[PDB]
Amino acid sequence: HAVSAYLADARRALGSAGCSQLLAALTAYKQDDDLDKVLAVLAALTTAKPEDFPLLHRFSMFVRPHHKQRFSQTCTDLTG
């Protein structure tokens, strides 16, 4: 039940509009495989407040294997 836990936490922190935008970005990524675009949406939504930083890190579940490390690296680059 990790997907539902993520969706619940993300909705609670970001609101309906933010959750919907992140979900649309997620479907776009599932379709076209463009890592940087969805990372842009996710970083804009989650890095504004430090308390939301975990959401970013937890997005790793949706990433395909060949994009894992870059994403992990990029996560640290956005968090410090």
Domain with 74 in it: what CATH number? 1.20.1160
Question: Would you state the structure tokens that stand for residue 63, as one six-digit string?
Answer: 């990433």
Contact 6, 46 (CB under 8 A): no
Find the radius of gyration of the CA atoms of the chain: 12
For residue 59, the enclosing domain spans 2-79
Contact 41, 18 (CB under 8 A): no
Cβ partners under 8 Å of residue 57, min gap 6: 75, 79
Alpha helices in 1-80 (DSSP H): 2-32, 35-46, 53-58, 68-79
Breaks (C-N over 2.5 A) in the chain follow: none
Q: For residue 75, what are the contacts with CB-CB under 8 A and spacing of at least 6?
A: 56, 57, 60
DSSP tag of 48: S
The coordinates were experimentally obtained by X-ray
- Phi then psi dihedrals of residue 33, to 5 deg: 65, 40
H or E element, residue 67: none
Q: Domains in the chain: how many in total?
A: 1
- How many other C-beta atoms lie within 10 A of the C-beta of residue 32? 10
